[PDB]
Symmetry: D3
Subunit: 312 residues, 6 copies
């Protein structure tokens, strides 16, 4: 089931074919049409009005710049445009039909009452028009290019963390710090770095744009639970694999035997790990709130061990 | 080696540049040209005629709507079009030259005899034309947009299943169901759910369109073999990672000692797993059959354990 | 931080919108403009001249075919074009502004002194023009389509290899080669094949084009170190997952007891593994050198074991 | 260091050679001499009077029947006998000289002041006499044949228990209680017996006679501590290995899956184990108290496990 | 409960004090008395006649040489001797009273009807006499010195074998048999000897004399069961620890890789083990049969492993 | 095969029955006879003269005090005694016939030429006599009561050490030495004592008297070999189980993390262990040398581990 925004969220209607966005303004000359994306052109933003009654399950597309609603009809010219009255006419209601395969994140905006589908193309004129809904062409598909949203918070569902793999990794094996006997001091210093992995994968809810940059603590396995490592301050990219460093540092000393050659082996458990999470976002322009569910996954390490053993 | 369809399979010739498909009809006015995809326009489908003799290794592109074959020549006008006689003229044979990098799933359709390459563009006219084969431009590349195929069957090669990782995961650890002694009944109920993973990756054979929706049992590791779990009835998307739930349920009771505090620990082995498979497909319009080889991979769980231990 | 080429490396400036490359020649008629990629058109290659002084942090875009530099101004017509003097005029310096989200691998070429941004479109004329830098449109973004580079060498940083997972896999379990007693010979032959995995992932440095084909040994885990398996001679594709076969073959015989039924179990450790690496490349036309850092990852196997045990 | 009884404990003086006990009575005719043991003849019991002053480290041997003390002199006849005054004369003090090898649990009773040693023989007359202390003969050795003591209590030092060995032992392996699916009940009954071991070994303190019969709980390993199993009510023999039965009984049922063949494997950890202990004894005739330290050792079992696993 | 022989088994009555055996003959002069053991003197053998009726629980001691029965009375002289009629007189019945501690394997032969106990001493005359049963002296104790019995068979209860400990022991670790590559032959020879242990401990039934020499196979652990190793042909001594050698020999060759340094590690599991058993014996003079239950225990080894691994 | 001393070793001939030793002197009156042991009476020591020629396999018993040899004949009186000429007469040669069962460490001294066996008794006169060799009585058995020997050295065959059992034992588990973060010092002190075991068991060679006290280092398992722990300075008793203390002491400190609660777990491997050995002894009076082979066995511990782990 594709994600359809609620009434207070704004978006751009990007065409698969034209690779351009629909615009609706009060001037210049042409009131509605297509244009290359310009994140600041209020012109290019719309929100939806959820149909009710006999329109339940349908939607009206409202211009943020004009407040007017889009329409699509086949008899009267022009076949498409704007109009007042938030869905006053049957011409303002559309059915959202998700595509398949390469068009799975796209959809047709079909207006039932007239059996017409919106068109967004650059090869034929008018670029923004409609077509008899029964003959499906690729240039009738649209995808949501949502407004800039800010990631306010990431909350992991730690109780459900899970370890997918685990192999011990010896950080500092070599350790032949010795003497003959009755010394008094032998200190060890551990400083090893492992390149870790991080990926925040979409599961459900609001469709955060792939690549969106943000910061958050990342999961860590303690000994019997998962915890959030707030130290990691790297910049992540939504839905993409990121890498970050994890350095293990430790200082310990050993010496109090009849005569030994102290040995220290620092070891950690490394492997793949994933944890569910919810992200809270809000509109930068409005503050409108939404959530997104996801699964975080990455190569990590845990259970740092220091084993001391004497030799003679 | 790119996948070239056999003689009975239909497809659309999508251009890298124009992002449009070639069409060949008997009318209206222009007989051949470019058009946005329309899965129902017979107009846009072609199949290949495998060259033989001195043409072995070359192909003729036959219109499904017209039966006519495409041609490409540089002296006589028009330089491209249709013509009867399934490869009667040397102008009907083409060499398929796979591209590299971003064009690896695309190819040029070069007609040797004339040293000309087909062209599919929208920036210059004619949109469907040809060019002296020696000067390679991006708008000379095409990719196969195969006909809608149905996935009739998935057959796993279970003998070759393989476990990539494995870590024990305790589903229900806590279990302090007690009394002092000589009770008579202490029953346990286990109900834990794990989010699993599923991906059907292409290996060879017919190139199933990424995203194609279908249903099939998914692999499972028994104790010494792999088996197909037919219960999982989720809808998969070819070549993409899907998730699904696996719930473990169990009821067992323990009590017959001198005086105990029965403890139950339910545990499973979880980790990554993959298994080879063959998919059998057939043309929805013709029933023409083909196969696709692939490797299925996913996070799974297995070997559910229930350990009972008394305490006093 | 996006990768900006040094002064001696050539590239094409591909537009996000137009999906076309900028060209600068001495003739025919129009000197600069847009064109579909043609890897042999010297016309389409440029290199950068690193600004210094008050221009430090800015760049001039030099035509490889003409030696002339690009410019962008808003008063005098034409607003864009070529000109001698490697950055003689303030009009030749540009600021490279990386985009975000879907435009993260793209950037604007803004000329500060005039507050103008280059434009690359096919929907409006002139196709190659500029726009008041303050109004950002999608057709103002460009990405680097670097010159054909050759991968001369792959050097792994073996000391940092790491095992992400590990599960024992018994290749040949069944082995009931017997007799009663005092025989004299019982030989075993092992021949098992496992499909392995290989991926060379970009980490930093020169951005090798995804898909680039090349050959190199692949990492292998010995017993206490990682080593390069030079036998694997498959063709890899940069930044993509490849598969390859690994066959284990072995012949051993056992017999010298009071009366036994020799059993042989061949086993290997399989799991995921990754190792850092540096790739050395050079321009095919110039020999200009660069490097790329990356992490190699794949499903592998190691520690082949043969265990013999008698039965009676 | 041999165990010398305190002043209130009674004993018999058994001779190595004569294999007979010393007696001291008021009548019949001969007042002191040798006799076969008769546990009821008060005649044969003596206790010691710890010398003090210049006699510190020496002892007087007091008759329980007569109260008189033994003496040994070489000039005046008879050379040995009884006499009043609890050590009034220098002739009443003896030095206890432990033997070696086969005489390690025996000792000479040498009277320094006169350089004479007591004699207990049956081959020459007088049977009970003395000899010039400088010429050591075997018939000058004695051992303590203590009075009947009762073992009132055994207290183990559980904190110091120790596991010497441990191997898992599967009690009930076979378990193929099945059906096809959706049954509802499958109960299991475990009843297995293991022959255990028990030995109470002397360490220090009062020398309990080997073989002495008594009853006490025996050590058991819980999961993280040792505990006393009070159920075992077998009769032990001090300082000797005893065996006893341990039966494990358990009843548990399992069934609540999509279709399984429930399997149950009952397992225990068996091995050698030992624990220190103190025994409290008291004179049956007097109630005089003493203690004995010892180490208990035996083959035991612990950590009974029940593992349930489904099959299909 | 002490072991009392059935009616057909012969024995000598050895006295604790006298350390001599009772004899009953028809001549010379003294008919009954004491004598140093002489295994061939029929004179010294007796068997028992189980009392019945009011004598149930009592026994008559019958001379094997004379057929006459022993008697004990206090009025008429002599107080002890022989007499016809297998228990005709009340004087022929005795109660067997086991001693404690050092006398636990000894017993008094008390004749109730007269309140008299048999006496066996060498310090007073008559050496063989009796005493008022109420005054217990050490020289009233006897032990059974059974007739020479032959151990016809040892049958182990293998199903109940048990492993008390287990630690892996590498027989032949070192193994660096190599070459560079493509050799063709590398054979290994294993010959290691371990000193094993063997003890047949009495549990119940006939009391086989400690030290009795005999031969039998000894237990061995296969892989899932215990088996009898019939190869071990050492001479055992009943109830005593014996040692014996176990040599592991094996010849195996390995070579068929791209280039290796074959390594072989031969390993075994060693530890303590015990198994119950029954011994079948019979009188050498009569063939009278009996059985003895026991537990066999010893340090053993099992599960010989040969692991081959290549190096480069 | 019983141990027969070589020609230069002295011993006493102790009788089973008489429990007395044979003596041969030049005066007083009776030249040969029996006597209670007196370790200083040269009178009681003899050595053997190995027969050769037709006497090979027989021995003469030579008096150390007199140099004369023992004899045994049945016609001429006295039947036994001394005589010059180290075996001059056939009467001086004896066959040593080991007994069985309770007489396995005893033997008859039979003089073939006359068919007579030596006798050692106290119940009949003469106490030291002989008897017609064909009628075997218990008082014809003798055992060797060797001269006082000194244990000069114990040499273990470390290469053959063997671990019979092994279970980890945590000495100091509890360890919650903490703070919040950035402290700087946290030191640990380990001091735990384990009661160990020691037994030197006879295997072959000279029969060292049971109980003989001596001192020697005891075996210890390092990590890959056995070594002698020379610290243990306890007094051992040949052929008997001894106990001794082993204390593990260690001081180590840990602290250098972002914020932790350092935990330390000290652990050791404990279990049963045995090692072969040879003992070198020599006569205290002569210095005559001999050796004894044996197996040392005991409960020990090894591989002390210190594991440090942080908590938060
Ligand atoms: C002004 C008007 O109504 N024009 C229409 C054309 O747009 C229409 O062309 C097609 O429209 C579809 C839209 O999905 C595709 O863009 C297709 O490529 C076009 O051919 C034609 C009928 O086909 O009718 C009028 O001319
Ligand atoms: C009608 C005709 O023959 N026209 C051709 C042009 O198409 C041709 O233009 C180029 O064609 C290639 C095809 O690969 C690219 O589209 C390129 O961008 C075009 O410039 C020119 C020669 O270049 O010749 C005629 O005009
Ligand atoms: C010749 C000239 O200066 N023309 C310009 C137009 O290009 C310009 O149009 C826009 O340009 C931007 C470039 O980022 C986009 O392509 C946008 O879609 C166009 O509308 C207009 C002003 O908008 O001004 C002149 O006509
Ligand atoms: C009455 C008296 O004084 N008699 C002694 C003997 O007892 C003594 O004999 C020895 O005594 C020792 C005691 O340790 C042993 O029993 C030894 O076998 C005896 O020979 C002799 C001197 O030896 O003197 C008196 O006769
Ligand atoms: C001929 C006769 O009846 N003599 C008895 C003695 O034997 C008896 O002596 C004791 O017998 C017991 C037997 O258990 C012990 O051997 C003890 O040492 C002896 O003293 C005495 C009474 O005591 O009576 C007669 O003399
Ligand atoms: C002086 C002499 O020759 N006396 C012998 C007795 O010793 C002998 O007695 C037996 O000797 C054996 C020795 O093994 C046992 O001690 C047995 O108990 C005695 O009976 C008898 C014959 O038996 O002959 C002479 O008297």
């Amino acid at each position: 089931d594709i994600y359809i925004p609620p009434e207070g969220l704004y978006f751009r209607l990007l065409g698969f074919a034209s690779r351009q966005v629909i615009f609706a303004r009060n001037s210049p000359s042409p009131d509605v049409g297509l244009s290359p994306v310009n994140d600041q052109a209020t012109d290019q933003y719309f929100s939806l009005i959820y149909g009710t009654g006999e329109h339940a399950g349908l939607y009206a597309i409202k211009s943020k710049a004009t407040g007017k609603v889009l329409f699509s009809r086949r008899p009267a010219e022009p076949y498409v445009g704007q109009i007042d009255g938030d869905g006053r006419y049957p011409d303002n209601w559309f059915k959202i039909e998700p595509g398949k395969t390469y068009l799975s994140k796209y959809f047709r905006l079909v207006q039932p009452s007239t059996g017409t589908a919106l068109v967004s193309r650059t090869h034929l004129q008018p670029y923004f028009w409609n077509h008899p809904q029964t003959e499906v062409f690729d240039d009738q598909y649209f995808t949501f290019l949502f407004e800039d949203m800010s990631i306010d918070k990431i909350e992991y569902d730690l109780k459900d963390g899970r370890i997918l793999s685990s192999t011990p990794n010896v950080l500092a094996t070599q350790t032949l710090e010795n003497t003959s006997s009755q010394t008094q001091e032998m200190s060890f210093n551990l400083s090893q770095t492992l390149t870790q992995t991080s990926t925040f994968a979409y599961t459900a809810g609001f469709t955060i744009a792939v690549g969106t940059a943000f910061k958050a603590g990342v999961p860590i396995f303690a000994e019997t639970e998962f915890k959030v490592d707030i130290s990691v301050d790297n910049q992540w990219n939504w839905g993409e694999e990121n890498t970050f460093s994890k350095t293990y540092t430790a200082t310990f000393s050993v010496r109090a035997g009849p005569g030994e050659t102290v040995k220290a082996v620092s070891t950690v458990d490394s492997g793949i790990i994933n944890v569910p999470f919810t992200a809270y976002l809000s509109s930068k322009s409005t503050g409108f709130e939404v959530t997104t569910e996801g699964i975080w996954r990455g190569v990590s390490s845990w259970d740092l061990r220091h084993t001391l053993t004497s030799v003679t």
